[PDB]
């Protein structure tokens, strides 16, 4: 049975099926809630919008990222985003697919513990696994040796690898990324 790949990131969810060449779904990792009143009776008001539906209605919503610096700081919103990713974007049943999540290095243990608990309980995945983003980047580059500088929306980190051996004492993690550049701009 095929497996799912769910690179979460702090600014964009990229999900797909293990074996493809590119993520099947790429949407913002964002949850919006209406701030204004709501007058048209019967318009069918939703409580919250996720993904890029919240991006087109963003004029009336207040947007929130459930991931600040690689750390998930709102587990309800993250559960909403995962539910969306599985049912509305990929349109699968999580009970029939092992899931490969991804995480940045040097971030709290409770993050991975809650990730796996959420998966196994409120999604009933058959199995899962949590990889490191830099190792996967090196896989994709077609190498077994190199220092990879990953820089997403929340966190920048270097991981030096040699012959497939990591040097965990030389991993350096920095906490300015796309979002801090957006704020500075």
């Amino acid at each position: 049975t095929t497996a799912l790949v769910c690179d979460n990131g702090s600014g964009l969810v990229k999900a797909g099926f293990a074996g493809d060449d590119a993520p099947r779904a790429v949407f913002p990792s964002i949850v919006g809630r209406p701030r204004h009143q709501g007058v048209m009776v019967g318009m069918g008001q939703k409580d919250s919008y996720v993904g890029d539906e919240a991006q087109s209605k963003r004029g009336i919503l207040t947007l929130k990222y459930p991931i600040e610096h690689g750390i998930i700081t709102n587990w309800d919103d993250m559960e909403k985003i995962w539910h969306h990713t599985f049912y509305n974007e990929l349109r699968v049943a999580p009970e029939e697919h092992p899931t490969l999540l991804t995480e940045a290095p040097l971030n709290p243990k409770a993050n991975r513990e809650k990730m796996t608990q959420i998966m196994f309980e409120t999604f009933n995945v058959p199995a899962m696994y949590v990889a490191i983003q830099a190792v996967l980047s090196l896989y994709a580059s077609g190498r077994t040796t190199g220092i990879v500088l990953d820089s997403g929306d929340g966190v920048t980190h270097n991981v030096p690898i040699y012959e497939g051996y990591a040097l965990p004492h030389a991993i350096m993690r920095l906490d300015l990324a796309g979002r801090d550049l957006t704020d500075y701009l």
């Binding site: 019967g42 318009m43 069918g44 939703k46």
Partner: protein, 714 residues
């Protein structure tokens, strides 16, 4: 004894005592003969270890212990001990093999089309049922008609006959034979008169359905009248709600009413030239959505039959050419084309050829038609003001106009026929012959199917009410103290959420009025209002390999799934009163005769529901009598029925509902003497004080009552 006066037909109506008495002593066991499911038969006898030509070992609480051979040819399954699907299925199979196509079912009358001429109807040698009841004679529908006669005469109350009709044949022959019986009893006859102009209904209210080729898309309620003392009078037929959405929209592999294609058969070029119309069906949209022709029937002979029907009717040249003009104009509507006015939001015409055709045809003006369509007007207080229109709104208006034209033309032909078959002295009483479409379960269910299923739901709850009150009466009769929740209403009152003005169709109109409403928004609102808060409302199981549904309801005929795509287009009917006024003045006198007699909200759902309630009130004032026709096989060969088809039919025919409800008896209600004699191996007080549960029986006035599953031991 009392059967040999049917002679050669007695063998069919009730076998001689010999084969029956040798059949009541068959050696069969209650613990080595059960019923198990199957792939081709779905239900088979067997010997958990089971063998009948194929071996399987399944759970021991899914097998059906076969009925005792004491009862193995009884024509009324209301007395068996093991009431379950394969029991009734193979019981009908057997009683049909040893040819007896007639059967009693509790209160229904299940008959099967034999595909074979039988003298079981003719001559009167069999029609001697005069005076008898249903319970004593062999189970013939003529006995039912005689009971209807007796009842209508002895209570002065109207009676009702409800047959299931979506079976292609068996409906026709059964209607014919019963109306012939009624002609005989209370005696160029009225039956001749009925079948003369019937091509009218055949050509206007029938079309090729994906699982048929001649389906009545309306209800036929024949009122055959009797004298105050019981001599037949003239008979006026009544028609009801029609699937008029068919006028515009048709699914794939189907088509709308025949008359279009009959005319389009290029048979009489006088018509095709009077209507300025070609013969290619793919040029007129209101008919060319599905298939343009079915090879299972020719259209020239249909046109000629319809011409003959118009001739035998009092129609003149105008009462025929005018109807042709109405149909042609409805067809020329189908390719009316409009565009937004440049730089602004208003429909503007592009090409008026079809407008010219229609204006000439109906006796209207082209400019007046175009503007009144493009500029609706309202009576605001004591003033007149024009209304602007988007293109889609005008297309809605066009479709509604065509629908109303067709509908009122149909109704007027109904009144014309009712007049042409009416000349008689003042009458009082009549018998109702209600023909109706049955339940539908196709592989792709849509809105019209929801409508028909709701109609059948109402009719089935009606029947259940009737059987409930009759059973309650019978239980009061023998002093049998037993009360229960009303079987007739409550179990189904919860599945008519569709009618509650918050349910499915209610929310449907709500969205029809709601701006920018989409099928996704509609699905959202539905799920808000019903998902989880209803047990009958459930999410469909869309497994890849089938077309997607969007919700699932649990009716009495199983659990049905629907696909909501396109329903706003099905329900909206904003009628344009300006063109109505145009019609009410037209030179084409038929148009004026149609539309002679201090709007933008009409929904097909509303009219459908109100006509349904009208028919329900029409029924509830009378006494009903039910009939269940079955098509045994699709290859039309006599003798053998294909069990999965017939099983699905009987599921949707609703007799299984009666079985399930009598299971809540005490369906088995026997006298004292019969059980005292048959089971004396050792007045009924001592016989059943010997032994089981004491609620298994209810002793009263020489009557013993048994729950199903008790006489399989005896």
């Amino acid at each position: 004894a009392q059967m040999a006066d049917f002679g050669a037909a007695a063998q069919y109506l009730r076998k001689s005592e010999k084969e029956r008495l040798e059949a009541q002593t068959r050696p069969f066991d209650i613990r080595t003969e059960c019923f198990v499911p199957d792939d081709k038969e779905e239900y088979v006898k067997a010997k958990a270890e089971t063998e009948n030509g194929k071996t399987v070992t399944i759970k021991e609480d899914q097998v059906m212990q076969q009925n005792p051979p004491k009862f193995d040819k009884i024509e009324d399954m209301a007395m068996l001990t093991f009431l379950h699907e394969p029991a009734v299925l193979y019981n009908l199979k057997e009683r049909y093999a040893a040819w007896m196509i007639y059967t009693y079912s509790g209160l229904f009358c299940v008959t099967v089309n034999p595909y074979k001429w039988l003298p079981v109807y003719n001559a009167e040698v069999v029609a001697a049922y005069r005076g008898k009841k249903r319970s004593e004679a062999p189970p013939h529908i003529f006995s039912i008609s005689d009971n209807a006669y007796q009842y209508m005469l002895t209570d002065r109350e109207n009676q009702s006959i409800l047959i299931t009709g979506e079976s292609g044949a068996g409906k026709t022959v059964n209607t014919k034979r019963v109306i012939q019986y009624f002609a005989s009893i209370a005696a160029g006859t009225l039956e001749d008169q009925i079948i003369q102009a019937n091509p009218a209904l055949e050509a206007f209210g029938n079309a090729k359905t994906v699982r048929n080729d001649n389906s009545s898309r309306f209800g036929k309620f024949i009122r055959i009248h009797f004298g105050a003392t019981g001599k037949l009078a003239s008979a006026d037929i009544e028609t009801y709600l029609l699937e008029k959405s068919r006028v515009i929209f048709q699914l794939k592999a189907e088509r709308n009413y025949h008359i279009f294609y009959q005319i389009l058969s290029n048979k009489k070029p006088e018509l095709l030239d009077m209507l300025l119309v070609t013969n290619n069906p793919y040029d007129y949209a209101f008919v060319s959505q599905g298939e343009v022709s079915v090879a299972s029937i020719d259209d020239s002979e249909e046109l000629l039959a319809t011409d003959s029907a118009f001739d035998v009717l009092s129609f003149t040249a105008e009462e025929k050419a005018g109807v042709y003009k109405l149909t042609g104009a409805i067809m020329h509507y189908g390719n009316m084309k409009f565009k937004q006015k440049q730089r602004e939001e208003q429909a503007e015409p592009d090409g008026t050829e079809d407008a010219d055709k229609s204006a000439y045809l109906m006796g209207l003006n082209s400019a007046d038609l175009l503007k009144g369509l493009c500029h609706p007007r309202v009576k605001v207080g004591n003033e007149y003001v024009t209304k602007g229109q988007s293109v889609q709104q005008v297309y809605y208006s066009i479709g509604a106009l065509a629908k109303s034209v067709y509908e009122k033309m149909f109704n007027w032909m109904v009144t014309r026929i009712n007049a042409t078959l009416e000349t008689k002295q003042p009458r009082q009483y009549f018998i109702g012959v209600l023909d109706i479409a049955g339940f539908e379960i196709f592989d792709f269910n849509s809105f019209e199917q929801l409508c028909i299923n709701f109609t059948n739901e109402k009719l089935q709850q009606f029947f259940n009410h009737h059987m409930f009150v009759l059973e309650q009466e019978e239980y009061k009769k023998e002093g049998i103290e037993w009360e229960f929740i009303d079987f007739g209403m409550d179990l189904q009152a919860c599945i008519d959420l569709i009618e509650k003005p918050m349910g499915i169709m209610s929310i449907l109109e709500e969205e029809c009025m709601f701006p920018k409403a989409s099928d996704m928004t509609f699905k959202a609102k539905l799920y808000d209002n019903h998902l989880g808060k209803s047990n009958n409302f459930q999410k469909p199981r869309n497994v890849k390999g089938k077309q997607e549904a969007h919700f699932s309801l649990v009716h009495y005929a199983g659990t049905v799934d629907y696909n909501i795509m396109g329903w706003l287009e099905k329900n909206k009917d904003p009628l344009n009163e300006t063109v109505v006024g145009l019609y009410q003045k037209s030179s084409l006198k038929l148009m004026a005769t149609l539309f002679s007699t201090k709007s933008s909200f009409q929904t097909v759902s509303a009219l459908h529901r109100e006509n349904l309630n009208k028919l329900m009130t029409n029924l509830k004032t009378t006494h009903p009598h039910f009939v269940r026709c079955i098509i045994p096989n699709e290859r039309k060969a006599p003798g053998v029925m294909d069990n999965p088809l017939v099983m699905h039919q009987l599921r949707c025919n609703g007799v299984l509902e009666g079985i399930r409800i009598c299971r809540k008896g005490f369906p088995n209600r026997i006298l004292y003497g019969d059980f005292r004699q048959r089971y004396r191996i050792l007045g009924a007080e001592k016989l059943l004080g010997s032994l089981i549960d004491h609620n298994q029986y209810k002793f009263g006035h020489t009557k013993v009552f048994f729950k199903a599953g008790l006489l399989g031991l005896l």
